[PDB]
């Protein structure tokens, strides 16, 4: 378990970057399409431009061992409040759980051997 990042959904990426980067000092680390990943002294923050959604993303190593550890408990959640492990197009393996406020939580790890790794 590396870090817990809020995943914000904002209307204008440039305005968001103006606040978080230029005003608050966040460093823009990675960007693809309408997605952005920032860090303030190492702590991550995810942004998605949007002119239920994922509000939290938990970065981890070996998401399979974590998923197995949590499996028995995840089996007790309403079927529509949990998603199975899935290799995503953007280079991350992840699974989802719905939170009490209605938004979703993501567990995510970069793909290991045998896959294209995005920088």
């Amino acid at each position: 378990i590396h870090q817990i990042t809020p995943f914000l959904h904002i209307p204008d990426m440039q305005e968001a970057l103006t606040l978080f980067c230029d005003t608050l000092g966040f460093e823009l680390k990675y960007r693809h399409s309408n997605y952005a990943y920032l860090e303030l002294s190492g702590c991550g923050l995810r942004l998605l431009e949007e002119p239920a959604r994922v509000a939290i993303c938990i970065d981890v190593s070996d998401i399979d061992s974590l998923h197995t550890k949590l499996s028995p408990a995840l089996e007790n959640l309403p079927a529509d409040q949990v998603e199975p492990l899935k290799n995503m197009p953007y280079g991350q393996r992840e699974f989802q759980v719905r939170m009490p406020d209605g938004d979703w939580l993501n567990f995510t790890a970069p793909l290991a051997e045998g896959h294209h790794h995005h920088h």
Copy 2:
């Protein structure tokens, strides 16, 4: 800058603790009234029961030096989108900034020297 914690506002504390602690593995570290602070492998997550607000809390040390460094840029933000440094009755010194999604962000730190911790 120690961590960036999401600050969730949930319908029922017990139901939320069951999910995060019992199902996902988080540890409850402090609770008071409708507020709770948990950690997963040392990573923070804050909760508030509510049967626009702060959705992000950034835990820091020496928040006074940080405020000074951000001050010039904070001065260019709409007046109603920024709050000055202020000591809170709940043991933290914080300042706030409104985010592009309408919710707020907190920079917070426990009172330094001279205070009961």
